Structures are given as C-alpha cells and as structure tokens.
Design a binder for this molecule. Structure first.
Ligand code: NI
Length: 107
C-alpha cells in the first residue's frame, strides 16, 4: 500500500520528464494529486486496478455500474489484456486529449 506508492512515485518522475505533458504548467502538483486519487482505489498485487476495485470506487461516487459496464470502462483505458488498468494507463487517460468515460467520471 504505502509500499506501492514508491513505484507510483517513480512513474510520476517518468511522466514529469515526458515532453508530451510539458505544456501543463501544473504537472508537478497534478501528478501528485492524481497519485492520491489512484491510491483511493484498492490496488492489486501488481499495483493495478481491477473490476471489483473499480466497482467499489464508483459506488462511493454514487455511480453504480453493471459488471459489463465496468468491463467497458476498463477496456477503454487499459493498455494490456482487458481486466485491469495500471497507473501509467491511468495517467495517460487523466492527461491526454481524448476523454474516456472513466476520466469524465473521476474529474
Ligand atoms: Ni482485487
């Protein structure tokens, strides 16, 4: 938990130096806030967010979603084999010009 944060920090540093996101003057503090938002979710053994974790989080936001709807949400932001999405997946979505449904829900 607090351990997995170490990895999130390394990723934030990686993104901080990414020219693709340099135009955002508030990147330094935003990445930290996004990290905190990500850590509100239950993170699995690999530090990724799964279906039940997403379900739990959306419940807290008053946004109930069906099992299949949860699959659609993750499948939209996941860079791997649909089922879970990572922190890097999360940042590219939160940043990035395209607006995934999960991004609109969370922001
Ligand atoms: Ni889980």
């Amino acid at each position: 938990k607090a351990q997995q944060e170490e990895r999130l920090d390394e990723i934030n540093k990686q993104f901080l130096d990414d020219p693709k996101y340099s135009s955002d003057e508030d990147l330094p503090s935003k990445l930290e806030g996004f990290k905190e938002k990500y850590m509100e979710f239950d993170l699995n053994g690999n530090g990724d967010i799964d279906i039940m974790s997403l379900k739990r989080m959306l419940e807290k936001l008053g946004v109930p979603k069906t099992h299949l709807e949860l699959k659609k949400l993750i499948g939209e932001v996941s860079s791997g084999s649909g089922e879970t999405f990572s922190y890097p997946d999360f940042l590219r979505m939160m940043l990035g010009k395209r607006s995934a449904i999960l991004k609109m829900i969370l922001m």
